[PDB]
Amino acid sequence: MPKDNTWYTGAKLGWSQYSRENQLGAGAFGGYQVNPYVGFEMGYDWLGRMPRKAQGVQLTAKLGYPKLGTDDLDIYTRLGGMVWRADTSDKDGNGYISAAEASVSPVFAGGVEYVIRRRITPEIATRLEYQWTNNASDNGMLSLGVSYRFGQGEAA
What are the sequence ranges of the domains in the chain? 1-156
Helix (H) or strand (E) holding 50: none
- Give me the phi and psi of 91, to 5 degrees please: 55, 90
Distances in whole angstroms, Cα of residue 40 to Cα of each of 31, 114, 118, 135: 5, 19, 27, 23
CATH topology of domain 1-156: Porin (2.40.160)
Distances in whole angstroms, Cα of residue 15 to Cα of each of 22, 63, 130, 148: 11, 23, 10, 22
Long-range contact set of residues 59-68: C-beta below 8 Å, sequence gap at least 24: 59/83, 60/107, 60/109, 62/31, 62/38, 63/37, 63/38, 64/33, 64/36, 64/37, 64/38, 64/39, 65/37
**Are 18 and 147 spatial neighbours (Cβ–Cβ below 8 Å)?**
no
Strands 139-149 and 38-47: unpaired
| CA proximity to 44, closest of 54, 31, 55, 33 | 55
Distances in whole angstroms, Cα of residue 39 to Cα of each of 29, 42, 106, 130: 13, 10, 18, 18
Torsion of CA 16, 31, 89, 25, to 10 degrees: -20
| CA proximity to 129, closest of 27, 4, 5 | 27
The experimental technique behind this entry is NMR
Q: Say which DSSP state 107 is in.
A: E
| CA proximity to 23, closest of 139, 155, 102 | 139
Contacts of 103 (CB under 8 A, 6+ apart): 83
What is the rounded distance in angstroms from the CA atom of residue 111 to the CA atom of residue 131? 8
**Are 117 and 72 spatial neighbours (Cβ–Cβ below 8 Å)?**
yes
